[PDB]
Amino acid sequence: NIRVIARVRPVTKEDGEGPEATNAVTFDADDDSIIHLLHKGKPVSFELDKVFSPQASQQDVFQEVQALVTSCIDGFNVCIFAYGQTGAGKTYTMEGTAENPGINQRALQLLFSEVQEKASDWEYTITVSAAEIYNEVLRDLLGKEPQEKLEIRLCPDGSGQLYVPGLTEFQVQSVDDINKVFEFGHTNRTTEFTNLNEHSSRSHALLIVTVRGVDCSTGLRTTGKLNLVDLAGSERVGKEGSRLREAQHINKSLSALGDVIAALRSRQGHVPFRNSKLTYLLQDSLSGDSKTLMVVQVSPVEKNTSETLYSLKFAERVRS
Ligand SMILES: Nc1ncnc2c1ncn2[C@@H]1O[C@H](COP(=O)(O)OP(=O)(O)O)[C@@H](O)[C@H]1O
Ligand SMILES: [Mg+2]
């Protein structure tokens, strides 16, 4: 149910030239689950569920996702997380570019094509919401300025399921529709009266896709949730006051996410969902028969081996 993989991005301009850009990440010839880090002259090795090299394409990465996405059609819930330091490629993996679309566009494209193949008795509705978690505050990335703080409430039917009053939902039917939603989101982040955080690297951004089906011949209903999560950057911040508090919020929320996934993966009795807004919000898409994919992004170069080490230790911790 719970899988942890790493993606090593290629060298970027930010990596520079000279000794700092020397390669530090190598691999095993036979086992694609192994990653080797050279850290301050000493080798450290890690085992994950799968490791993607700097040659891995967006399509290669999506092969880890396509089966999860089709299960949402059937009513399963899924979370996909991108984790790692700012600059390691989280947004590239999740959103991609026009020339190289990421997981978000490929997942929605696959949902639309799967829906189009269902029998004529079925009616599917696909909607998207987008939310920001900044310093444990939840706001609607697609909401009207000034965006209020949102509450996470228990459904009043006693099911124990959670909902977010006032979170906006956009109906989408095509990749062109989702592109229009994403463009609106980008513009909406920096309006004059916004309460959204300008620095995307310091907040968790969640794209919540809801897939609702009804078999119109019987009234049978399915509800699948696909949560596409571009996490705040994990890098350590050297010792603002407000910058430090922000870094501490991020550290505690990411650590809580790791605690929750590790507890779920090991099928321990107590899963501490309540310890963070992110894990509490997503608990119905993490527990039970839900499926989770954690994608740990790392830089390949010597300059970043401290943060690569921290990121890969996080990956091994949640695996386990
Ligand atoms: N797999 C990849 N292939 C090519 N370029 C990448 C890849 N991952 C990241 N990049 C590039 O690295 C830079 C930082 O990536 P970004 O997605 O902004 O990282 P993050 O969201 O983790 O801060 C961007 O310029 C992006 O184009
Ligand atoms: Mg980013």
Residue numbers in the entry: 445 to 683, 687 to 767
What does the paper say about this structure?
The new KIFC1 (2.25 Å) and KIFC3 (1.85 Å) structures were determined by the Structural Genomics Consortium. Both proteins were crystallized bound to Mg-ADP and are reported here for the first time. KIFC1 and KIFC3 are similar to one another in structure, but show differences in the lengths of loops, as hypothesized above. The largest difference is observed for L11, which is much shorter in KIFC3 (14 residues) than KIFC1 (30 residues), while the adjacent helix α4 is three turns longer in KIFC3 than KIFC1. Despite their relatedness, the kinesin-14 KIFC1 and KIFC3 proteins show different effects with the AZ82 inhibitor: AZ82 binds to KIFC1-MTs and inhibits both the microtubule-enhanced binding of ATP and release of nucleotide by KIFC1, but has no detectable inhibitory effects on KIFC3. In the case of the KIFC1 human homologue, KIFC3, an L5/α2/α3 pocket is visible, that again is smaller than in kinesin-5, similar to the size of the pocket in Ncd. In KIFC3, the side chain of H630, corresponding to KIFC1 R521, is not long enough to interact with L5. There are no other interactions between loop L5 and helix α3, consistent with the open conformation of the potential binding site. Kinesin-5-ADP-BI8 superposed with KIFC3-ADP shows that KIFC3 helix α4 is longer than kinesin-5 by three turns, elongating the α4/α6 pocket. Several residues of the KIFC3 α4/α6 pocket are present in similar positions as in kinesin-5, including a tyrosine, Y757, that in kinesin-5 (Y352) is thought to stack face-to-face with the benzimidazole ring of BI8.
Kinesin motor proteins hydrolyze ATP to produce force and do work in cells. Despite their diverse functions, the kinesin proteins contain a common motor domain with highly conserved or invariant sequence motifs that mediate basic motor properties, such as microtubule binding and ATP hydrolysis. For example, kinesin-14 motors move on microtubules towards the minus end instead of the plus end. Here we report a new crystal structure of human kinesin-14 KIFC1, together with new crystal structures of Drosophila Ncd, a KIFC1 orthologue, and human KIFC3, a divergent KIFC1 paralogue, and an analysis of the structural features of the proposed KIFC1 AZ82 inhibitor-binding site.
